[PDB]
Structure 1
Amino acid sequence: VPFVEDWDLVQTLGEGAYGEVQLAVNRVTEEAVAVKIVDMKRCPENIKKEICINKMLNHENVVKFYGHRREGNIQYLFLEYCSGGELFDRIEPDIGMPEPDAQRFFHQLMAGVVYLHGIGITHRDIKPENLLLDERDNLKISDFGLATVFRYNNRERLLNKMCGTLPYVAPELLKRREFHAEPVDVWSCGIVLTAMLAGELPWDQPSDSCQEYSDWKEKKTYLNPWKKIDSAPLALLHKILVENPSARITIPDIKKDRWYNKPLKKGAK
């Protein structure tokens, strides 16, 4: 058993356009889970898609989906709780974080992205606010509200929907009518890596009109944020933040990168 199906809402984890995320604790087991609550009266289609995609997810670096409950016009998505909070909060403004910590988070982010791409899913909005940490500081990708299928029955479909978050979005999304999904998620991962190592975002958007983006294209790496980044991870960023998505490094090649494979001091937590 009796009561095992009861959950107590104990605290608000966050509030935003998606609704709110609360921490819930099981009345009997004390198991902690996150609950995304949405007033479907203010979706029903978006919600269904998010649930359908969540149902496909089973990986250690992706927030797990436990199920959902519909109480009238309120939808309840039960998700894996990540007590370590958002990666965003581990990034010190203007500083970033220690390189070994950034590398470990990057390895884990890559593992989650490889998994998603392997099942034909693109996240479309990778950024530190959406990357969560568990009790051992293991990274988990969250928020599949913009996620979509880019490969089905072994055939790729090109994307055309402009979406994401400007400082993280790849340049082809702003310039081209259609584009491949994978390089767009690679690019945002490179912006996340830059933020972790420098504590700042390099540009407002990767447009010709953006001076900071122009400076990067001109290899002015003596300027911030680049100047703050050691040569080895900077060499990886030179391969990721490549304007032409067809020339941009792919994940299998990121896995062969020198910095990616450099032993640094960091363990779980």
Structure 2
Amino acid sequence: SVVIVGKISFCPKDVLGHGAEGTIVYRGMFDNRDVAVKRILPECFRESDEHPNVIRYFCTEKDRQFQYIAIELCAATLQEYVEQKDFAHLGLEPITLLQQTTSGLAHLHSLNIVHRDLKPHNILISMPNAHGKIKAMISDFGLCKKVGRHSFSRRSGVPGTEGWIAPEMLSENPTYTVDIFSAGCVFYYVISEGSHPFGKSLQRQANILLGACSLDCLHPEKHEDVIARELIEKMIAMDPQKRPSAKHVLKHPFFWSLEKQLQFFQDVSDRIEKESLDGPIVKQLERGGRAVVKMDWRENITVPLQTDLRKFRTYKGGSVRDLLRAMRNKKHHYRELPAEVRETLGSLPDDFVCYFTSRFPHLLAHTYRAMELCSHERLFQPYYFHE
């Protein structure tokens, strides 16, 4: 059986879920798209602003009783993506998912919209498009699994959504900073494969009020975890005014490709070449630098790179600057290096950069913080967000 209401069709047997006041969601079609079709009693009293990572409400039609609303169809929630056993990613990896979620949020904030209740239940994973690709999209309605059915609601604290309360309830009208906190919590949730940064649910609110977060799954000597921690801690900062904007989160190293990581190192090295050892920039760079370099970096690299460097009496092993200079030197002269050196370093850029970030897990985090001094400069505008 089939119901046609203008440009929207659906089969009444294909029920996906139920909502309040006899609202119902069916699977259907609109304009050769598979869509969710929400049927509602009408309540009384912008296509040009669409974005791939915010859910689309395509069309509204009506018969004599109901309105029918065509809505962009999801395969799963982020809750299911993260939690379900053996869930196929289908080519959508966590960092990309979070990247897309933050883009949708930056878009909403660019329109002066605050979500206020961003959680795993309302970040939806799309059906695969014509090109076999899936995406994250932020929804106003959250979905909670209940066989082949889901409850949908816009409300915070409905059954199923208990450990994710709207941040405004744990505290001025809501600003972007509530969304960033929630995003920060979602970031950790995905990365930790289901944990909350404010602990188990019975103590979670109490922990949020005091800023007692614990990012235990992030190892303090792994480059990827050092970067993720750096960002996530800023996003869930107890003080709302220290939280970065969505566009600011998007510029963070957490999202940089290996090529971009290597280019950053190359650029700071170029920037600090003629800089005096006693100037403000090199001082910022050498402060706390002994731990970053593992006291002597020349004792923490491979024997073939060690041997090739021995000629360079210039490079000091206690120095963060000289490690960056050694890196930039060997990237620039890579072609002309001995076979054994190209082999130990591996290919440009991906193996090369990982040679150093695996050995020196604080190098990028430390260099990123230190080089904020040059953030307004033209060369570094790709790496930092400006107000």
Pick the TM interval, shorter chain. Answer: 0.5 to 0.7
Instruction: Provide, for residues 77-106 of structure 1, a one-character-per-residue CA deviation record: whole Å limited to 9, x for no partner.
Output: 111223x322221112699999x8111011
1:77 alignment partner, SS class: strand
13, 16, 20: which one pairs with 1:13? 16
Provide the residue aligned with 1:107 in structure 2. 99
How many residues in Structure 1 have an aligned counterpart in Structure 2? Answer: 224
Q: Per-residue deviation at 1:44? A: 3.5
* 3-state SS of 1:230 partner: helix
Check if 1:74 corresponds to 2:69: no
Query: By percentage of residues, which structure has more helix?
Result: 2
1:251 aligns with 2:246: yes
Structure 2 residues not aligned, in runs of 5+: 143-154, 260-349, 351-387
State the distance in 2 between where 1:219 and 1:201 align.
Answer: 9
Q: For the residues of structure 1 that align with 2:101 and 2:93, how far apart are their CA atoms? A: 12
Residue 232 of structure 2, aligned match among 227, 234, 237 = 237
Which structure 2 residues correspond to residues 1-269 of structure 1 after superposition, within 5 A?
Answer: 5=7, 7-9=9-11, 11-17=14-20, 19-25=23-29, 30-40=32-42, 43-45=43-45, 57-82=49-74, 84-92=75-83, 101-134=93-126, 135=128, 136-143=133-140, 164-165=156-157, 167-169=163-165, 171=167, 173-175=169-171, 178-198=172-192, 199-202=194-197, 203=199, 204=201, 207=205, 209-210=206-207, 213=208, 217-218=211-212, 220-222=214-216, 230-263=225-258
Shift of residue 181 of structure 1? 1.8
Cα separation, 2, equivalents of 1:171 and 1:144: 17
Give per-residue Cα distances to partners, 1:192-221, cap 9 Å, x unaligned. 1121112123443754x34xx47x845654
Partner of 1:137, secondary structure, is coil
CA distance in 1, matches of 2:169, 2:185: 15
AA at the equivalent of 1:121: I
Question: Given the two structures, how large is their TM-score scaled by the length of structure 2?
Answer: 0.49
Kept in 2, the 8 Å contact 1:171–1:243? The answer is no
**Secondary structure, counterpart of 1:69 in structure 2:** strand
Q: Work out the CA distance in 1 between the residues paired with 2:36 and 2:195.
A: 29
- Whole-Å Cα distance in 2 between the matches of residues 243 and 12 of structure 1? 42
Please tell me whether Structure 1 or Structure 2 has the larger radius of gyration of its CA atoms: 2
Q: Which whole-Å deviations, capped at 9, do the CAs of 1:108-153 have from their partners, x for residues lacking one?
A: 01110111111111222212221222212211112269xxxxxxxx
Q: In the alignment, is the contact (CA less than 8 A) between 1:126 and 1:188 conserved in 2?
A: yes
Distance 1:251 1:95, change over 3 A: farther
Residues 203-240 of structure 1, C-alpha deviations (whole Å, 9 max, x = no match): 43754x34xx47x8456544xx5569933212211111
Q: CA deviation at 1:247?
A: 1.4
Equivalent pair of 2:116/2:167 in contact (CA under 8 Å): no
Paired AA for residue 183 in structure 2? C
The match for 1:48 is none
Deviates more, 1:197-206 or 1:71-80: 197-206
2:382 match: none
> Mind listing any 5+ residue stretches in structure 1 that lack a counterpart?
46-53, 146-162
Shift in alpha-carbon separation, 1:121–1:39, aligned structure 2, 3 A: same
CA distance in 2, matches of 1:73, 1:112: 34
